[PDB]
Amino acid sequence: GIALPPAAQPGDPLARVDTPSLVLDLPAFEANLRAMQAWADRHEVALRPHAKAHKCPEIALRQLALGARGICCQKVSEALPFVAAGIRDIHISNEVVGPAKLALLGQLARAAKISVCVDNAENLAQLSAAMTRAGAEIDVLVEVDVGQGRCGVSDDATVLALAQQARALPGLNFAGLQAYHGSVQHYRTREERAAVCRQAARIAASYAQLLRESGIACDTITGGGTGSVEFDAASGVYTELQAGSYAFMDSDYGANEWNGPLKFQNSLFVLSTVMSTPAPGRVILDAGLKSTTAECGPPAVYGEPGLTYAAINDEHGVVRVEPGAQAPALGAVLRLVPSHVDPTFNLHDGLVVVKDGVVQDVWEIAARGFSR
Amino acid sequence: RGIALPPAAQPGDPLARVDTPSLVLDLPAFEANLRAMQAWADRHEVALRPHAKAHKCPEIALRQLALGARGICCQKVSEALPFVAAGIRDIHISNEVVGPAKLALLGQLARAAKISVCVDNAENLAQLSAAMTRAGAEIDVLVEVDVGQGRCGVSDDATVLALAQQARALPGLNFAGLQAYHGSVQHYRTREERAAVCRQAARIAASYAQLLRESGIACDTITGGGTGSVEFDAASGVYTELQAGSYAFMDSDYGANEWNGPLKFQNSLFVLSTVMSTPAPGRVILDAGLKSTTAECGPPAVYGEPGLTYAAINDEHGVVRVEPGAQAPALGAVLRLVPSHVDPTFNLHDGLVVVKDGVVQDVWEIAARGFSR
Numbered sequence: 001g002i003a004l005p006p007a008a009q010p011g012d013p014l015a016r017v018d019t020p021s022l023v024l025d026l027p028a029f030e031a032n033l034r035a036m037q038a039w040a041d042r043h044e045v046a047l048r049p050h051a052k053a054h055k056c057p058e059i060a061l062r063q064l065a066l067g068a069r070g071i072c073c074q075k076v077s078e079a080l081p082f083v084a085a086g087i088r089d090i091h092i093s094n095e096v097v098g099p100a101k102l103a104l105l106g107q108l109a110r111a112a113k114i115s116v117c118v119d120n121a122e123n124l125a126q127l128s129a130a131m132t133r134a135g136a137e138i139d140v141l142v143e144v145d146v147g148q149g150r151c152g153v154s155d156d157a158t159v160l161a162l163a164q165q166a167r168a169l170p171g172l173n174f175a176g177l178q179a180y181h182g183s184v185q186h187y188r189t190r191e192e193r194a195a196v197c198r199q200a201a202r203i204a205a206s207y208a209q210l211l212r213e214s215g216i217a218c219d220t221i222t223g224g225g226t227g228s229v230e231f232d233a234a235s236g237v238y239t240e241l242q243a244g245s246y247a248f249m250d251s252d253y254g255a256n257e258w259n260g261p262l263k264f265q266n267s268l269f270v271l272s273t274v275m276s277t278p279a280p281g282r283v284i285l286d287a288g289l290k291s292t293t294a295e296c297g298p299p300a301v302y303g304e305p306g307l308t309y310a311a312i313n314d315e316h317g318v319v320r321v322e323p324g325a326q327a328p329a330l331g332a333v334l335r336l337v338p339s340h341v342d343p344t345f346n347l348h349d350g351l352v353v354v355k356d357g358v359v360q361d362v363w364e365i366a367a368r369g370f371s372r
Numbered sequence: 373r374g375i376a377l378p379p380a381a382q383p384g385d386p387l388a389r390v391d392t393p394s395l396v397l398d399l400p401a402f403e404a405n406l407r408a409m410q411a412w413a414d415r416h417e418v419a420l421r422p423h424a425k426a427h428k429c430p431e432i433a434l435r436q437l438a439l440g441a442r443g444i445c446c447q448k449v450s451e452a453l454p455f456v457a458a459g460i461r462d463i464h465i466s467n468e469v470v471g472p473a474k475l476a477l478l479g480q481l482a483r484a485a486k487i488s489v490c491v492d493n494a495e496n497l498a499q500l501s502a503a504m505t506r507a508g509a510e511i512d513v514l515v516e517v518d519v520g521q522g523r524c525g526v527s528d529d530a531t532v533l534a535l536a537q538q539a540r541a542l543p544g545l546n547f548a549g550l551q552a553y554h555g556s557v558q559h560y561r562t563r564e565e566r567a568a569v570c571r572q573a574a575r576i577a578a579s580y581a582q583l584l585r586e587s588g589i590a591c592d593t594i595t596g597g598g599t600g601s602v603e604f605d606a607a608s609g610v611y612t613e614l615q616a617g618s619y620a621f622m623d624s625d626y627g628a629n630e631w632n633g634p635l636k637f638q639n640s641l642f643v644l645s646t647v648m649s650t651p652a653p654g655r656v657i658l659d660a661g662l663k664s665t666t667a668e669c670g671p672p673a674v675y676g677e678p679g680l681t682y683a684a685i686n687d688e689h690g691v692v693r694v695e696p697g698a699q700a701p702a703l704g705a706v707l708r709l710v711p712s713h714v715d716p717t718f719n720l721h722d723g724l725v726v727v728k729d730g731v732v733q734d735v736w737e738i739a740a741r742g743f744s745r
């Protein structure tokens with residue numbers, strides 16, 4: 001029937017890309033990748049960047065080319081397109097619960113070098129049974145609660161027991177701890193973040209010491225996000241960093257204070273067209289909730305003081321034109337910074353890659369919608 | 373040897389064995405909602421043109437048409453393509469189309485199907501005529517009027533009249549009437565307030581239609597309405613066509629409206645989620661977060677579990693608070709969640725697991741997912 005033309009062709013000026021589109025500024029992205037890897041290298045810790053941020057095997061390949069020690073995925077099915085692209089060192093930074101999931105994990109563990117988290121005795125036993133059935137081996141990290149109050153163990157006896165059992169069980173190798181504090185990532189001041197990161201590191205170190213004193217090596221302590229890796233890398237406790245959003249940035253992370261040694265550029269935008277100029281004081285954009293999420297608020301208009309993206313609907317954004325500011329014309333194309341990287345990536349099937357205002361390529365967000 | 377991802381669901385599966393998270397449709401509730409909306413429209417002798425933006429699913433639109441819907445609405449031109457591929461050829465683009473590639477695609481769509489579109493801008497009306505002329509196509513044009521939402525739409529008599537006169541005179545365009553959509557009244561909570569605001573919206577639309585008629589221009593269609601307002605819009609004597617979308621499904625934001633009148637809808641749309649951690653007394657963690665259901669209107673609700681409150685929502689986790697006295701779900705238990713907002717949740721998924729009496733019937737393709745160009 002009717003064919004849908006691609007939104008962008010290599011060689012197109014950005015202004016001719018069809019909207020809304022998710023756009024990557026390649027030089028900013030590349031600089032962010034280098035900066036995070038250099039930070040890890042400086043502190044002699046590993047970087048295992050989180051693929052949930054972008055769900056894009058081409059991006060993971062570029063991270064690995066710069067020295068990343070594998071990637072993280074949050075869900076077992078999310079790993080499949082990365083393995084298809086030849087990426088075979090993957091940490092599932094989550095617990096895996098459900099018969100189909102553990103069966104799939106067993107197959108993944110035969111095809112690749114996999115680790116997973118556990119925080120539950122029953123699940124550790126389910127994991128062992130599934131590995132044994134699959135003829136597979138997996139590394140196991142015990143997840144500890146360091147203050148987020150999501151998943152993770154919070155008592156010594158349970159950490160010790162899970163580690164002892166992973167050691168004794170066939171198909172399982174005890175590899176260390178996952179210690180991730182999600183809430184600290186967006187505490188605004190560096191002083192606030194540093195204080196909570198110090199406490200998270202102390203908790204993780206205490207569990208690692210408990211294990212060591214019981215004769216169990218605790219070789220990996222992994223965790224950290226884009227807001228905390230400034231501190232986690234220097235803790236002398238974390239051995240591996242799991243930052244994901246750093247390559248892109250968004251307006252929520254943008255609101256943090258970044259006046260220390262580690263800073264990232266905006267590289268990720270939603271391109272949108274002005275499609276109504278209905279009254280003085282406002283214009284309407286064609287990018288709404290279906291193109292960028294708003295659990296953390298609306299997107300921000302990039303490089304346009306005076307324009308304020310206000311109400312967001314399904315397929316419309318209401319932009320207020322502040323008094324004194326020039327209203328954009330009908331058909332004008334604007335760049336928006338999403339408020340939150342990962343859920344925005346998960347709305348799109350393709351990423352338009354730009355350099356010097358010209359389209360270079362379109363990369364496949366091949367793991368979009370893989371949450372099983 | 374590439375690793376195959378098994379389907380989440382197969383016909384015959386018990387619901388509890390469906391892999392999670394999955395978007396699930398209760399077929400009997402859905403069918404009841406479809407019938408109730410079509411009956412409401414027929415009772416008031418107005419057309420129903422249900423909005424496909426809600427579900428992006430050609431199978432659902434086919435079922436709406438089979439009950440007597442007069443075509444469908446789409447919000448974006450590219451969203452229409454999978455519906456045309458499924459044989460649907462009466463489509464209203466309930467939005468303005470701006471941008472050279474969009475207008476070119478609209479030209480091709482208008483050759484393949486009977487299309488209407490909205491305009492609120494003189495320059496764009498001229499662009500639309502040019503694009504139709506270039507495509508060799510004809511399209512129906514509705515002038516969008518602001519009836520109180522303050523989004524798009526014209527708000528002065530002179531412009532409504534000029535646009536209609538020009539659509540009549542321009543090649544490739546046929547003036548078909550008015551789009552009058554009040555999006556913000558839909559979730560005003562009391563029926564008393566929705567009714568009052570709907571009466572005023574109807575009066576504004578009627579006054580524009582009157583203006584056109586008095587100037588010798590017929591105004592055949594006045595289209596608008598959403599799930600929250602169609603109780604009142606159908607009975608207005610002004611609207612000729614209703615554009616409700618969410619009614620087939622419902623969600624927790626619409627659920628918070630007062631619904632104690634003659635028109636009510638059942639919950640038919642759920643996100644199925646597994647308990648994947650039981651880390652402390654008082655909470656469990658679900659495997660459905662923002663990547664499976666959106667939260668611009670708040671978190672989803674746990675269906676049928678009074679003492680379980682879905683609290684914090686992350687990317688791939690939901691923190692569920694177990695109320696004092698309530699029974700915490702076991703590890704691996706499967707729960708149904710009602711999304712806070714239908715359309716953006718549908719847009720996260722590629723397939724819809726269709727269930728009847730606890731048994732999987734089918735999986736329908738959400739074929740227009742991600743089509744916002």
Ligand SMILES: Cc1ncc(COP(=O)(O)O)c(C=O)c1O
Nearest residue numbers: 093180224225226242243244245
């Ligand atoms: C397990 C895990 N590691 C790392 C991160 C870091 O993510 P980001 O740097 O994108 O904030 C997250 C998300 O918060 C996470 O859940």
Ligand SMILES: Cc1ncc(COP(=O)(O)O)c(C=O)c1O
Nearest residue numbers: 466553597598599615616617618
């Ligand atoms: C043009 C248009 N018509 C109708 C509706 C009603 O949609 P729903 O009934 O799903 O709320 C909307 C969005 O709310 C809309 O944008």
Ligand SMILES: [Mn+2]
Nearest residue numbers: 245340341342
């Ligand atoms: Mn995030």
Ligand SMILES: [Mn+2]
Nearest residue numbers: 618713714715
């Ligand atoms: Mn909606």
Ligand code: NA
Nearest residue numbers: 166167169172
């Ligand atoms: Na072992």
Ligand code: NA
Nearest residue numbers: 539540542545
């Ligand atoms: Na005409």
